[PDB]
């Protein structure tokens, strides 16, 4: 399973050729507090793209876990605000055996009832006020899929981007996917926030992929072992055009990455990948990083930052590509290496799901605002 998050069922129709969109995420709410006794998710989804596009051709899909689904009655959001166009409905796609999937749809370009602007190619776009509304509220749905269900497996979404003209394969890098953060996920409040450069990040989000054995980057550089890896890939997303050179403050900051717990002892290198977001032709395959760091993690059991660790440098850039001036995003890759196969290692735990997070930290260890993501690794109960 080559599958990011390890998720057992999706499309896999194949990839188009890199294209040059940069982005495209799904930022839910929590579903904490209030929100249980309430039937709606709210949400919003960002994009962008680095030359123009245009048509219906490209066609923005969002897959929620079925659990969820189940129970989903519409799905709406705006477009990109700017000429006046109207409020959005996510369609329900259908098999061919009369029922219902949990796959929605929704064109990308905004001139094609769909949600960016075209013809615009610089800061993060967002398509606001999203609401998922279900047939009963939330509450009565996590009793139904039952509070030991929740703990074992998250509910997870995908986003992504699919193209007509390529018999709707996926357009490759373009595509996330995460969990629904719930009431049992503290971690994000152990983290104090910083005031440094608040306003520069829209949102982070981390995937994870197992990679096989004995691959590389193009230099020779970086590789996964013996055993194979689990690659995280912190992306964040930016509000404007931020050049860490130029404006960052509280520096220097730290790159901070967190294991689930359970895998510390069956992770040995861990390597740190500079990545980048290409102008034309999108590409973000192992291939194409460059290894910058040996990292370490917190091995000490009992302690209290067990399975966390961090980097800084004096110049930072040495290590991630910000993108510098740009408002394309970045990606930042860790590349954990597995002790012995993913099955042995599964076989010698025995259900509940891996789970990774990666944030930015000024010199303070104070989040920067909107760079902390959270993502997870299946495991079947
Ligand atoms: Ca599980």
Redesign the pocket.
Known sequence: NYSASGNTFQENPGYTKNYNFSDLQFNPKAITGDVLQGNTIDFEVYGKHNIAASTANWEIRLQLDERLAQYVEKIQVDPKKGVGNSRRTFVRINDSLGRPTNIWKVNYIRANDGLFAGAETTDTQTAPNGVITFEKNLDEIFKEIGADNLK???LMYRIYLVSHQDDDKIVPGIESTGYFLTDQDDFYNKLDVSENNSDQFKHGSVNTKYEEANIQTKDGSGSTGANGAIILDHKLTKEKNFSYSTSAKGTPWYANYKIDERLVPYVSGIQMHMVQADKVAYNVAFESGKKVADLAIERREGHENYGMGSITDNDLTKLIDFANASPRPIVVRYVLQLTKPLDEILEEMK???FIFDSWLSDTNKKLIQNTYGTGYY????
């Open positions: 074992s497996d998250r259900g509940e799901d299946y495991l079947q109960d």
